[PDB]
Amino acid sequence: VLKFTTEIHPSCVTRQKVIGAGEFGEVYKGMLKTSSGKKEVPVAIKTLKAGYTEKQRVDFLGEAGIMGQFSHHNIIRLEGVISKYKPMMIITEYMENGALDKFLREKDGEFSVLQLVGMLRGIAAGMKYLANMNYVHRDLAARNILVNSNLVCKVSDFGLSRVLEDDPEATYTTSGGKIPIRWTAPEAISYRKFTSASDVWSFGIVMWEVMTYGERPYWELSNHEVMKAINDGFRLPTPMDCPSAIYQLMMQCWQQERARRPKFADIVSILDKLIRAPDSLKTLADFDPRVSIRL
Ligand SMILES: Cc1cccc(Cl)c1NC(=O)c1cnc(Nc2cc(C(=O)NC3CCNCC3)cc(-c3ccccc3N)c2)s1
């Protein structure tokens, strides 16, 4: 028995603005009337346009069904679905600052170290919750994390191919594409061994995305060049202005041997201890001089 997913009546949903457009549906900002007409809240609304295939329907509704099993501050909240009327819709809370990667790239250098570390603690708490629920995300990356007005970060992007046994799409993105290599642990790339410990590798890459304000991991390297570097033992260098303890933690997430990586519980605990003793964050890792400027 799974937690009940609310079927929403279309009369309770208004769409105010298109915010995203795909080939197979759109995403809107809107309002949802709830509590039997007594409350109204802002929502995001994703549609599935007519002509969708059986696979697209099972995937679309499956994402909502997974989201509906979770109740955590750092996981996107589902309000419900419209499946009985067309276009079908999934309705979630609305995250005012959108995806974390784009948000940081529009906010370069504007946050404190403590704020960035706090964002990572929230993401880590959401991932701890997911891993404890026996959910392996497989595509953890800043692009799949949303940010609200209050800077709370929440994990998004769920799918049935992550939960069903021997699923033939388990190694693809939720859109059927190739999962971007540069967030993925070596044993998941080479053997398809996706587990919470490969999600810990990905979380280390997310830490580096956050501390760099959304830089592209490995910069211009191609996918094969990233695989070359990782398998030689190369790891991403420290971000600028990054606490030594934070860079050490991301390096531990990138241990080749998956059993040596921290668990999500370890990550949350370490981040909490650093935030509560903030002088621990003033020791910075050396930023490796990339350019020589002499005068
Ligand atoms: C509805 C739904 C169904 C299934 C799965 C999920 Cl996770 C969801 N929920 C959502 O997608 C979303 C919840 N909140 C969101 N916030 C959001 C917010 C905004 C938006 O208003 N962003 C601000 C606009 C001004 N710049 C600062 C960001 C834009 C998007 C967005 C959506 C599609 C393509 C590009 C975009 N930039 C998204 S999207």
Curated annotation (Swiss-Prot):
The modification Phosphoserine is found at residues 269, 292. ATP binds at residues 19-27, 46. Homodimer. Interacts with SLA. Interacts (phosphorylated form) with VAV2, VAV3 and PI3-kinase p85 subunit (PIK3R1, PIK3R2 or PIK3R3); critical for the EFNA1-induced activation of RAC1 which stimulates cell migration. Interacts with INPPL1; regulates activated EPHA2 endocytosis and degradation. Interacts (inactivated form) with PTK2/FAK1 and interacts (EFNA1 ligand-activated form) with PTPN11; regulates integrin-mediated adhesion. Interacts with ARHGEF16, DOCK4 and ELMO2; mediates ligand-independent activation of RAC1 which stimulates cell migration. Residues 1-295 are cytoplasmic. This is Ephrin type-A receptor 2. Autophosphorylates. Phosphorylated on tyrosine upon binding and activation by EFNA1. These phosphorylated residues are critical for recruitment of VAV2 and VAV3 and PI3-kinase p85 subunit which transduce downstream signaling to activate RAC1 GTPase and cell migration. Ubiquitinated by CHIP/STUB1. Ubiquitination is regulated by the HSP90 chaperone and regulates the receptor stability and activity through proteasomal degradation. ANKS1A prevents ubiquitination and degradation. The chain holds residues 601 to 895 of 976 of the full protein. The active site is at 139 (proton acceptor). It is linked to Cataract 6, multiple types: An opacification of the crystalline lens of the eye that frequently results in visual impairment or blindness. Opacities vary in morphology, are often confined to a portion of the lens, and may be static or progressive. CTRCT6 includes posterior polar and age-related cortical cataracts, among others. Posterior polar cataract is a subcapsular opacity, usually disk-shaped, located at the back of the lens. Age-related cortical cataract is a developmental punctate opacity restricted to the cortex. Expressed in brain and glioma tissue and glioma cell lines (at protein level). Expressed most highly in tissues that contain a high proportion of epithelial cells, e.g. skin, intestine, lung, and ovary. It is found in: Cell membrane; Cell projection, Ruffle membrane; Cell projection, Lamellipodium membrane; Cell junction, Focal adhesion. Belongs to the protein kinase superfamily. Tyr protein kinase family. Ephrin receptor subfamily. Residues 6-295 are annotated as: Mediates interaction with ARHGEF16 and ELMO2. Receptor tyrosine kinase which binds promiscuously membrane-bound ephrin-A family ligands residing on adjacent cells, leading to contact-dependent bidirectional signaling into neighboring cells. The signaling pathway downstream of the receptor is referred to as forward signaling while the signaling pathway downstream of the ephrin ligand is referred to as reverse signaling. Activated by the ligand ephrin-A1/EFNA1 regulates migration, integrin-mediated adhesion, proliferation and differentiation of cells. (Microbial infection) Acts as a receptor for hepatitis C virus (HCV) in hepatocytes and facilitates its cell entry. Mediates HCV entry by promoting the formation of the CD81-CLDN1 receptor complexes that are essential for HCV entry and by enhancing membrane fusion of cells expressing HCV envelope glycoproteins. Induction: Up-regulated by UV irradiation via a TP53-independent, MAPK-dependent mechanism. The modification Phosphothreonine is found at residue 47. The modification Phosphotyrosine is found at residues 28, 135, 172. Residues 13-275 form the Protein kinase domain. It comes from Homo sapiens.
